[PDB]
Amino acid sequence: YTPRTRIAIEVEKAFDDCMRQNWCSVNNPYLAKSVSLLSFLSLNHPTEFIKVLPLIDFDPLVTFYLLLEPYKTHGDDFLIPETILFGPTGWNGTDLYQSAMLEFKKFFTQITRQTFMVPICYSDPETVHSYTNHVRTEILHHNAVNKVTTPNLVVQAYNELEQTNTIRHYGPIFPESTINALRFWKKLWQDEQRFVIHGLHRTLMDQPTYETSEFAEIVRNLRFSRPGNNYINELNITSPAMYAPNDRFAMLVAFINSTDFLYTAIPE
């Protein structure tokens, strides 16, 4: 449908293949494209590499969709601009692989001070997880766990990081490039997608037998329910306006309790 859609469909057909042929190697074409894209900005646009590095996921399938956003047709707030991806100086999806899993893991090793040369995500990413632990304890153990209270508290934590770049009033967590790229509850939209796609991907890979029906449901989720056209109204588990309902609240408690809550990338 678009150049963004073309690469995704090719990767999805390649993933459906590798799963059938030999269960791939975790994510196989998603890993190649994630690393291909992740080596391109590192070599060619270090400011955009710095902007999105704290947001990359160890699940390369999740990283692929959070970076490309191939089904986003509404808005011009792509995480990485269309010019950098498909323009005359664009990536256009050309493979930049060799030792792909080695290359992917080495990307997380780059979350350091020297790479930025300062946000706490680059200086002390372990300390950022300490701050998010405090917020997690505050919401789940220091407040009422209600349909009325908990959804509002999750948005407030993302709100503080959005406009003040702080967690527990300690900052700066991210670069300002990263902050302005996550305006209007986009990070909460990213992190619910993390939690949802993580669960279905983990389930897909844990099963004995591969069935294309389950991989299609993951793709159907990213196309029709979380395409990226409108972040706050694509919120489901984390939407306070949405509060079957207690099943939804169950995933909210699990999301806060997960590492996808206020997600930040760390070396290991």
Numbering used by the authors: 11 to 127, 139 to 264, 274 to 298
Article, verbatim:
Due to the lack of a predicated homology model, the crystal structure of p35 is finally determined using single-wavelength anomalous diffraction (SAD) by a mercury (II) derivative and refined to 2.1  Å with a Rfactor and Rfree of 20.3% and 23.0%. While the high-resolution data were collected by the cube-like crystal grows in 0.1 mol/L BIS-TRIS pH 5.0, 25% w/v PEG 3350. In the final model, residues D1-Y11, D128-D138, G265-I273 and E299-N304 of Molecular A and B are not visible due to the lack of interpretable electron density data, suggesting their high structural flexibility. Homology search by the DALI server gives no structural homology with any identified proteins, indicating ASFV p35 as a completely novel fold structure. The tail domain is a helix bundle composed by α6, α7, α11 and η4. In contrast, for ASFV p35, the two lobes are linked by three loops, rendering it as a much more compact structure.
The polyprotein pp62 produces three mature structural proteins by the cleavage of viral protease pS273R, give rise to mature product p15, p35 and p8. Herein, we present the crystal structure of ASFV structural protein p35 (304 amino acid residues) and explore its potential role in core shell assembly. Membrane-associated proteins such as p35 may serve as a docking scaffold for the recruitment of host membrane and other components in the core shell during the virus assembly process and further stabilize the mature virion.
